[PDB]
Structure formats: structure tokens, C-alpha cells
């Protein structure tokens, strides 16, 4: 299973962000608002979660052979991931998620504060003009082989377009001592 593909718990669905390693042990990053739901996932057991304030969570794979260090492009191909980086305003980026597949756009702001109402407030989010829909959360924000973020939320949809916010992946990797595969 690669970045952008579906991960579920009971009737809930989110997307995998990036497969990573913690001291050689295969894990998967996704959104914290997703991991808050349950400890039991289709791919394994949750070992960390942080939402709101932040929006990241980590799951240890039941099957280490499934930790595919790529992003699925929804056209039968995958993008290889090799490093993690920080986004910059104007960067050309792509997002992969299980509801809308692959979409592209550019980073329009950094360190955005996002008020999700009853769900709470998140800080330090990457802002883009890429659309997303429910189910896309946790999926991959990347530029070529560089991982940048995890889909958190936004406004609009993929028909009318919208604004989306992402948790910077570097903060999630350092929270857990992980490295992208």
C-alpha cells in the first residue's frame, strides 16, 4: 500500500500519507484527526496521534512487506519518494488521496491557522489551491520524490475547486523519530 491509498477503521476512511521507518520498523503517517478515531486500522495498529493543534498520527504496519515507499498516482503508476522537505510559496505540488485521486496546484501560503469549529484549531499549516474532498485526509502532498505534507482539510471541492491545508511532514517525522522510505 502506497501514499494516497485508502486506510479504514470500521466505517471510516482516510488516506495513507507516507510509509516511514522508526528504527527499522515500518509505519505509516496519516492525519491525526483520522488516528484519533480508533487504534485499529486495516493496515495495523495506531502508535501515535496528535489532533488538533497538530494534524498527524502514525500506524505500525501489521505487514512490513506492505510499506511501499512511493505515492500512488491513480493512473496505474507511482511516484518514488526519497526525502522529506519543506514547502515554499509558489511551489508546484501534487496531492494524492482515496476520494479524488491525484490533483495538482501550487502552495499559496505557509503557517496558516485553520479553525475547524467544533473540531478545533490547527496551526502552522501549508496552504494550497489544490482541491480535496472528505476521505482525502492524511494523503500525500509531494513535489517529485520529495514528501512535503499530509492532507488535513479545506473548503470547496474538486468540481468548483477550493483551498486545502496540509500538516508539514517534517514535524510529524521528528515527533516520532521517523524517516521516509
Amino acid at each position: 500500500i502506497a501514499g494516497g491509498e485508502a486506510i479504514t477503521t470500521g466505517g471510516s476512511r482516510c488516506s495513507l500519507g507516507f510509509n516511514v521507518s522508526v528504527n527499522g520498523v515500518a509505519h505509516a503517517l496519516t492525519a491525526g484527526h483520522c488516528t484519533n478515531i480508533s487504534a485499529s486500522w486495516s493496515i495495523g495498529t495506531r502508535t501515535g496521534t496528535s489532533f488538533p493543534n497538530n494534524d498527524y498520527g502514525i500506524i505500525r504496519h501489521s505487514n512490513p512487506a506492505a510499506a511501499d515507499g512511493r505515492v500512488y498516482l491513480y493512473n496505474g503508476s507511482y511516484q518514488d519518494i526519497t526525502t522529506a522537505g519543506n514547502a515554499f510559496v509558489g511551489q508546484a505540488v501534487q496531492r494524492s488521496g482515496s476520494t479524488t485521486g491525484l490533483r495538482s496546484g501550487s502552495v499559496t501560503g505557509l503557517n496558516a491557522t485553520v479553525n475547524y469549529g467544533s473540531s478545533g484549531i490547527v496551526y502552522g499549516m501549508i496552504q494550497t489551491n489544490v482541491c480535496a474532498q472528505p476521505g482525502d485526509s492524511g494523503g500525500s502532498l509531494f513535489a517529485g520524490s520529495t514528501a512535503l505534507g499530509l492532507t488535513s482539510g479545506g473548503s470547496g471541492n474538486c468540481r468548483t475547486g477550493g483551498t486545502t491545508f496540509y500538516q508539514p511532514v517534517t514535524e510529524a517525522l521528528s515527533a516520532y523519530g521517523a524517516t521516509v522510505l
Binding site: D55, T99, V114, P134, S152
Partner: peptide, 4 residues
């Protein structure tokens, strides 16, 4: 905005 809302969480997806």
C-alpha cells in the same frame, strides 16, 4: 474549512 473542515477536516477531510
Amino acid at each position: 474549512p473542515a477536516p477531510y
